[PDB]
């Protein structure tokens, strides 16, 4: 299940096989992977965290600042594996920083294993 | 037929200051004047007659309040004039007022 979660996630971050609204939950303690695609699941976008850097880098900000002028859009942030719709049952399993400069900087580490960051 | 209802127009006209530097000491309070309507001894008549017959958004301003007395005029007539309404093509505002 360490390959499935990384692949299903990669595919969400590529918008191709799995649409963004799909939520894959990996229950570690009980060996269960639950994938929900149905309707009515409230979700919210979160910045993705990888290692400890964000994927949202100055490239995306610059491109998105000239948006409309370059017709970049939020959909390009989604389809660049930079932001991800997390939903309350997958939120069970994210480790969610709250801002980068607060929570991922090299303080005496709280966790250092953030998967996502509040936008 | 401006986008502002009449009480709003009337209210705005109320707040336009008038150059009553002298005439205020001449005029009676209307409550005290003995005449059945307004008269030039207890009031100053004003007219506004503006229609926006052009594409450009007509600004109705205190420059369009025409007094019946060259000494009681809106301050900005004697800088920019006080905006009373912006009018679209074909909208109009005709009214007369007394101060």
């Amino acid at each position: 299940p360490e390959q499935l979660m990384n692949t299903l996630r990669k595919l969400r971050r590529q918008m191709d096989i799995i649409v963004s609204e799909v939520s894959m939950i990996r229950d570690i303690r009980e060996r269960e992977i639950r994938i929900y695609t149905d309707a009515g699941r409230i979700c919210r976008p979160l910045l993705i965290v990888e290692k400890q850097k964000l994927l949202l880098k100055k490239r995306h900000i610059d491109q998105l600042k000239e948006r409309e002028y370059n017709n970049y859009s939020w959909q390009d942030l989604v389809a660049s594996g930079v932001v991800e719709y997390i939903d309350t049952l997958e939120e069970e399993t994210v480790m969610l920083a709250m801002t980068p400069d607060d929570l991922q900087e090299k303080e005496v580490a709280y966790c250092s294993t953030y998967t996502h960051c509040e936008i | 037929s401006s986008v502002l209802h009449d009480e709003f127009i009337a209210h705005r006209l109320g707040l336009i200051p008038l150059t009553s530097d002298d005439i205020v000491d001449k005029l009676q309070y209307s409550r005290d004047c003995t005449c059945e309507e307004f008269c030039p001894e207890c009031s100053v008549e004003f007219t506004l007659d503006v229609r926006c017959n052009e594409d450009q958004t007509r600004h109705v301003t205190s420059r369009d309040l025409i007094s019946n007395s060259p000494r009681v005029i809106p301050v900005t007539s004697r800088q920019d004039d006080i905006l009373i309404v912006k009018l679209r093509k074909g909208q109009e505002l005709r009214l007369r007022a007394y101060a």
């Binding site: 990669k10 590529q14 491109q63 000239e66 370059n70 017709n71 970049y72 390009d76 660049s80 | -």
Partner: protein, 104 residues
């Protein structure tokens, strides 16, 4: 000469893989029919590099903006598999490494 010129045009902007030649073109296609003829008439291309570091795929007076957006999950070694020898020579030109989709 050996620079990445990969483009990922969508279905409605599918440019012909070969130059426009009068002996390879024919009329088979006709608001409903307006999008149909567009497939084989407007779509050989050129890409303009702007000063702002963006580019646009033109197809003439039209302009579709493109980003050279990365595609490291599909860094395919794009090569001229022109069918010579066995299975083609697959001349090593530029590794396809992007997913540039034209948009208005």
């Amino acid at each position: 000469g050996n620079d990445l010129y990969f483009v990922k045009l969508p279905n409605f902007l599918s440019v012909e893989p070969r130059p426009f030649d009068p002996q390879y073109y024919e009329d088979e296609f006709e608001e409903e029919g307006r999008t149909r003829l567009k497939l084989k008439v407007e779509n050989n291309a050129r890409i303009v590099k702007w000063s702002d570091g963006s580019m646009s795929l033109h197809l003439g007076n039209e302009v579709f903006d493109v980003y050279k957006a990365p595609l490291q999950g599909d860094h395919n070694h794009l090569f001229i598999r022109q069918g010579t020898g066995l299975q083609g020579q697959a001349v090593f030109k530029t590794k396809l490494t992007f997913r540039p989709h034209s948009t208005d």
